[PDB]
Design a protein around this ligand. Structure first.
Ligand SMILES: CCCCCCCCCCCCCCCCCC(=O)OC[C@H](COP(=O)([O-])OCC(O)COP(=O)([O-])OC[C@@H](COC(=O)CCCCCCCCCCCCCCCCC)OC(=O)CCCCCCCCCCCCCCCCC)OC(=O)CCCCCCCCCCCCCCCCC
Ligand SMILES: CCCCCCCCCCCCCCCCCC(=O)OC[C@H](COP(=O)([O-])OCC(O)COP(=O)([O-])OC[C@@H](COC(=O)CCCCCCCCCCCCCCCCC)OC(=O)CCCCCCCCCCCCCCCCC)OC(=O)CCCCCCCCCCCCCCCCC
Ligand SMILES: [Mg+2]
Ligand SMILES: [Mg+2]
Lengths: 882, 882
């Protein structure tokens, strides 16, 4: 906590050695404080940290199901080599799921190029070697004498000891392209925010002209710019989506490790050899886990990103749009993001508070014949002249009458620009008037004549009070005022002096605000409509960010200043930030801290900005956006970088992202319930069946071929009501839903059991308990049961989706199954309904007797209606289906 | 034991003086044998013997309601007075069951007046005390010298010592009214059956002609008539119906003994309020018992008996028609029942086996002119000659052409009767014709000429050989044979005398037999079609019964006699009875012995009879059927009485007795299943519901208003494939239809347990676990949950009978139900108005919302499909969904 509090000790005296730094003292300084360097790095072993997640309940199944092959190996040959139709499928599934979990994050890693910039060298500095020279950056240290000249860049913060009308553009840290004066004088003892610390310089700021001497007092981590450079590394926190998917996988694992040992114990103690029990438990381990869930998740995310890639928005990280959908609080930079860093006239009125055409027309003249020096405020005046709709050409023709005799341009030493022009009225060369505008200070000091009530009077103390009150109403919004005044004079044979420019008749006041973008208000309203709070994080002065956001409609209440959050501890910081609004005067570390605390409270926080100072906040957020005017480094740190300028597209994301999550939270439940029910019946009927109902490979086929319809699940129609609230990744609701709707299938999977064990299978192959257990029709009976339960389970688990996807009254009310999904479903049922081919060496073909299908349709219909009842109960119990 | 083998000690002597018998002799007889009395008795405790059955669960239920009333009233005062609402109805139901069980049993008990009838005494006895007198059979002594005249009553079993062509009518024991000769000579010591007991007589027989002196061998219960009187009592054996009903009641008792102590323990261990657990167990016990089962059973039996009473067949016992339906073997008497006890001509034949009309004509005149004495034999000849297709009136003309000279009537010495007639053709006094008929043996000895092939030859030994061969050929066929001889006699000076009966000329022989009733063969065929075997237990000789067994059509092999069947043991008798179709020479002991043994072998046996000898078997059988020609004792001791003597109606009765059974079992399987289901769910809910789902009174109302339509089930449409095999009462068969298609209603009862837990929470009653245990909530919420699975449990168990009623036939191949049992069924479902009535305040039972019915319809439609699937699984595993 080494701060720069040595006031009046570091002024007028270097407080250290003047360039004669002792070697021992140099070593002491570099030990206790260190040098000025910025460290960065990359990684290429992302595979190690991206495999482990939901891959493990696949490599565990692989290890168990290959140890099964090893167990039947070394003893048997055909049973020990007929397994690989397992191991191979499970291994390629492991590889696919791992590669997909890799690509879901690879876009962020390979699209982040925040390293090309900085590491600046070749600094024009005064050194003891040869005076003013180009020196490498590693030769400037704490206590070194550094000079800022015309065109050189400051490499480290400085305690400036000499200044001469020095102006610096601090858009790198404050986001404001307008230059601000920087002086060598000691500031206030209590000081202010770091950006307003005139006595100290900032790394990364650009100087165009002027020279200044200073001494480096801070380097390393104490540099604010060093801070944002060091903060932007591969500290990519796990967003909401990753944690949600991990929690869902852990719910599945918590179910698997409770169900598997139970069925293992039952089938080991009850009837069979422990090899049969191991196979039986492997069946329940395979069935519970939806094998192609990562593929469906990736395809949903890809659909979202592709859709958002047509609204003209680069999506950098593929996992950004779901986070955009689940966005709860949007923290937004002010300078250049919602405003447009463009000075435009908004208040230009007489001393009574109404627009004066004459004064603005005079300003238009002084700015349109302004050939000496062009300045952004002059462009503001001229553009407002045309926005005013009062025609220019008369004034354009007034060049022939109100002829420009001469001009003293906007010289910065006196902050006065004075155009001396003659009023050729009606053809005669009349008197000459000069109009000077400049900063309010000198104008107020020199002005004693005022145009009031239509005449010219002296500047009385009451008129001074009135003018000061107008200045105060203009300043309280954080807007600077430039005074304009005309003076009449006879034809000047001699030149004009500064002392003659006094007692000049002032017209009024000017206000060049940075107006918010025309779509900002509509974007804020749309964001508030979809349950997304909006907060403002800007380094600008509090007054201007009350003025703005008192114009966009956002409730501005007790704007928190930077010092308050700096002195505030983390818990009450989180308490304040959530229940508050626009913040002011923040450093990049402050923005990152605020976003992080908002994250820790349980809110998925997105961020938007354009400046380099916003990079830390962009990277610390769940989803970092960037408007078109964003700087290149901010673009690289972004995730959903925009292109046009319109913020309306934000809602087109927030809508679309939500309709992705629903389509992903549908399947995740809609396939975890069924897969539970299918695996429930292989548990509570795992003791009465003298053989496993459906083998491991058959269940792998069922969970694979059915999961290719969920490839078309992302195109299903989410109705209109899920898309109004940012939904949280509630995995516990999954563990309830699949315990409520899942078992309703299991009973019918028992009805299919008894049926197919008593009337269908014994019909063709004779009654059971009368067949030789070795082989004869025992193989045929077992295969017929296998294929029949295959067909029935597939039908009944992929046709109930039309009943589960939507809340009450499907079809008629909510026209379900948008044609892509329903087409794929009926195109994949027609695939699984064919175990009649040469692909019946899957250890069951047993072409089903026609007698079975009437009993299959009767099961499907009655299961669909029972699921309707249980869906009603579930909706009426907790809050809804998902 | 003491058979008629005590010869040279008691036979050919008296062992006492002839009629010179003293007092010491009668005291010796009393000491050696005892009183000569017949034991008789009755009872009037039918109430105690007939209450116990399925009424004991009702009395236990009454006791438990009484305990609940006392417990809720010995502590509290307001709750302890609503228990009468259940106790009174249950205690009226106990009495209803008692009355309806006493009625369906005591009809046969008070329909038996066997002991009231019979009891004959006052026989003519000679004694030294007062000469000839009338001494009661209660006063006859062993060894009494008894004088026998025509028309007297035999006092005891009687070894005759003096006889002169003594003839005894033995229809009382053999069923044949035709007299049998009884001889006093020294007979065989080993003797034979009663029909061949030529040396001794039996009780109850009337002497037709002749006088005799005999000695009493035994008295009291040792006599055959005394034996049958002792065996025939009010010992109506438990028919198969009572055993089946007790088995069903015991199935229910085992089910409630397994369930009730489970619910009580679950609710006494969880939710530790033991009173509320006893209420749960009481509810389970109340809902498990079908409360109006005895009334439905009684109404089914009454419908069967009433509808059979219309077919000229008075039914004496309510259970007779049901036992007829469940009858498996029908044992019928031969004489009087299968045959018609009427001698009829069947073979008028010459001496060499050619149909000679001349012998028929000679018999015609020989009978038509026998005016001095008429007999059934002569009437038989006359009737058969009318029916022999030969025109009798032409023969009648010969009556005017053959006038009578004289006649020698049937004498008591030579046993021949003769008519001497003229041959006055056109009035011309030609030679006389003498025609003598009688027993073959005598006039076969006295014959000297025979007429063969139109000529006359001497009585050579060869022709006599063929005459006897054909005579005992007819005797082998059972035909009673008579011989007829003509003599061409020159005009005698005087009338025809005994010496005029020499030098006969035989013409031929005649065959008299009692042909079976013309409907006997058709009845036997119809019974054999319905899986009812027929046996011909009779006391007649083996020859005639073997002949009849061929005409009607039956297995003529293994004509098991009476001596051997008396010789062999019961265990072997069971084996040989099922392996034999015709039984001959049977004493009334043996008929009852055979019927009882066949009953013990697992066959429900009915008996048909017409005589006194039948009564023992009639009472020892499941159902006794009496023909029109039966003696009043046979009519009184039977259970079914015919009125048109047409056996063809019999099969019709069986059909009724089967369908009356089918509906009944269809009822028992309908209710006992549903009840179980509707009180299986409670078991499960016992661990989860915070309160009782239905109180005892609600379940009583459900089981009473649903059993008031099973009063209309007996009129439903029974199939036509169920009535082609005698169905046996099976308890296990109703315990496996109750575990199989019963728990398929629990699935749709745990659903309406949960739907009704989250569809009436919004019924202004708020969600549960939020209501204080006060009122207008916890009182209304519970009431609405009752009016839930009350209305729903009445709809789902009264409308699923149409699906279970029949074996596999969905709704159209059987025309499910008759208009009576569908109209009543829906008219009792329309009693879903109890909740919306002033009598909807039998505590609970509050007004249902309209919202419930769309779910009730869905549940009652869902449940029928599951019932169809389990019906198909049940039919295809056991064999009959009955
Ligand atoms: C009828 C049930 C009445 C409702 C009830 O008991 O509470 C609702 C209960 C959870 O209510 P909740 O408000 O979330 O209470 C929090 C739990 O106590 C918190 O418990 P939990 O949800 O963490 O329970 C964990 C456990 C709970 O285990 C179970 O509940 C297994 C029940 C299997 C359902 C099939 C029958 O489930 C597992 O994770 C393993 C189960 C797999 C083995 C099979 O939901 C169910 O258990 C649904 C049962 C399915 C009805 C059909
Ligand atoms: C649905 C499952 C019900 C099916 C069943 O019990 O097996 C019948 C069926 C054949 O029965 P069974 O071999 O004659 O068994 C008769 C007893 O073992 C021995 O025959 P029993 O003469 O001792 O009959 C006793 C009968 C009567 O016992 C009762 O009434 C007990 C009622 C307790 C139910 C309360 C809940 O209870 C049983 O059948 C004993 C098992 C209790 C069933 C739970 O067994 C199977 O084929 C198993 C079906 C597999 C689906 C589960
Ligand atoms: Mg399934
Ligand atoms: Mg029910």
């Amino acid at each position: 906590f080494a701060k720069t509090s040595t006031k009046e000790e570091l002024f007028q005296k270097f407080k250290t050695s003047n360039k004669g730094l002792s070697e021992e003292q140099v070593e002491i300084s570099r030990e206790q404080y260190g040098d000025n360097t910025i460290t960065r790095g990359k990684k290429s072993s992302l595979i190690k940290r991206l495999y482990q997640a939901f891959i493990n309940p696949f490599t565990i199944i692989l290890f168990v199901l290959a140890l099964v092959s090893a167990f039947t190996d070394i003893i048997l040959a055909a049973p020990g080599e007929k397994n690989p139709q397992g191991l191979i499928i499970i291994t390629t599934m492991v590889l696919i799921s791992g590669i997909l979990r890799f690509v879901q994050e690879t876009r962020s890693g390979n699209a982040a190029e925040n390293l090309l910039k900085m590491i600046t060298t070749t600094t024009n500095v005064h050194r003891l070697e040869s005076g003013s020279q180009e020196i490498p950056i590693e030769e400037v240290l704490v206590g070194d004498i550094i000079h800022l000249s015309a065109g050189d860049m400051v490499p480290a913060d400085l305690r400036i000891i000499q200044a001469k009308d020095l102006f610096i553009s601090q858009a790198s840290l404050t986001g404001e392209s307008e230059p601000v004066e920087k002086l060598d004088l000691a500031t206030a003892a209590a000081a202010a925010s770091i950006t307003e610390s005139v006595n100290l310089a900032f790394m990364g700021s650009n100087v165009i002209s002027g020279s200044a001497y200073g001494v480096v007092i801070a380097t390393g981590d104490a540099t604010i710019f060093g801070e944002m450079a060091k903060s932007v590394t591969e500290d990519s926190t796990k967003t909401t989506f990753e944690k949600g998917v991990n929690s869902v996988s852990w719910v599945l694992i918590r179910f698997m490790l409770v169900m598997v040992p139970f069925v293992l114990l039952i089938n080991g103690f009850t009837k069979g050899d422990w090899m049969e029990a191991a196979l039986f438990a492997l069946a329940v381990a395979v069935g519970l886990t939806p094998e192609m869930l990562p593929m469906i998740v990736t395809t949903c995310l890809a659909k979202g990103a592709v859709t958002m890639s047509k609204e003209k928005t680069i999506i950098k990280n593929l996992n950004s749009i779901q986070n955009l959908g689940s966005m709860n609080i949007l923290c937004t930079d002010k300078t250049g993001t919602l405003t447009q860093d463009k000075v435009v006239l908004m208040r230009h009125l007489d001393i009574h508070g109404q627009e004066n055409i004459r004064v603005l027309r005079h300003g238009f003249l002084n700015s349109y014949y302004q050939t000496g020096l062009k300045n952004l405020m002059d462009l503001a005046i001229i553009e407002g002249a045309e926005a005013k709709q009062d025609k220019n050409p008369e004034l354009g023709g007034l060049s022939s009458k109100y002829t420009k005799v001469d001009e003293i341009p906007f010289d910065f030493e006196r902050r006065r620009m004075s155009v001396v022009v003659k009023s050729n009225t009606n053809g005669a060369t009349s008197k000459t008037q000069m109009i000077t505008k400049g900063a309010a200070e000198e104008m107020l000091d020199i002005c004693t004549l005022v145009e009031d009530k239509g005449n010219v009077v002296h500047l009385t103390p009451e008129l001074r009070a009135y003018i000061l009150k107008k200045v105060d109403e203009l300043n309280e919004e954080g807007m600077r005022v430039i005074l304009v005044a005309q003076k009449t004079n006879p034809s000047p044979i001699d030149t004009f002096s500064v002392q003659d420019e006094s007692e000049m008749v002032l017209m009024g006041y000017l206000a060049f605000l940075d107006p918010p973008k025309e779509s900002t208000a509509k974007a804020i309203k749309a964001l508030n409509k979809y349950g997304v709070s909006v907060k403002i994080l800007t380094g600008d002065n509090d007054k201007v960010t009350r003025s703005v956001c008192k114009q966009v409609g956002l409730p501005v209440d007790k704007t928190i200043l930077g010092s308050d959050i700096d002195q505030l501890d983390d818990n009450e910081l989180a308490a304040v930030a959530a229940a508050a609004s626009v913040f002011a005067k923040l450093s990049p570390q402050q923005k990152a801290r605020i976003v992080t605390t908002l994250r820790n409270s349980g809110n998925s926080v997105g961020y938007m900005g354009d400046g380099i100072n916003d990079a830390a906040a962009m990277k610390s957020s769940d989803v970092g956006i960037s408007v078109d005017s964003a700087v290149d480094i901010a673009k690289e740190s972004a995730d959903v970088i925009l292109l046009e300028k319109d913020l309306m597209v934000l809602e087109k994301g927030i809508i679309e992202g939500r309709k992705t999550y629903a389509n992903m939270i549908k399947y995740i439940k809609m396939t975890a319930s069924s897969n539970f029910g299918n695996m429930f019946s292989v548990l509570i009927a795992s003791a009465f069946l003298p053989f496993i109902p459906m083998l491991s490979i058959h269940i792998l086929l069922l969970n694979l071929i059915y999961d290719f319809s969920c490839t078309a699940i992302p195109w299903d129609n989410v109705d209109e009501e899920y898309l109004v609230v940012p939904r949280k990744w509630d995995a516990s609701s999954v563990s309830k839903f699949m315990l409520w709707i899942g078992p309703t299938s299991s009973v019918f999977d028992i009805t299919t059991y008894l049926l197919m064990f008593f009337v269908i299978c014994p019909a063709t192959f004779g009654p059971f308990s009368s067949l030789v257990p070795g082989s004869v029709a025992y193989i045929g009976f077992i295969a017929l049961f296998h294929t029949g339960w295959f067909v029935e389970s597939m039908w009944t688990q992929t046709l109930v989706i039309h009943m589960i996807r939507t809340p009450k009254i499907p079809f008629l009310q909510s026209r379900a199954s948008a044609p892509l999904t329903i087409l794929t479903f009926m195109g994949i049922i027609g695939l699984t309904i064919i175990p009649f081919t040469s692909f019946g060496h899957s250890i069951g073909l047993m072409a089903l007797p026609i007698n079975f299908f009437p009993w299959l349709i009767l099961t499907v219909v009655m299961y669909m209606m029972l699921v309707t009842i249980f869906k009603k109960i579930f909706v009426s119990k907790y809050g809804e289906l998902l």
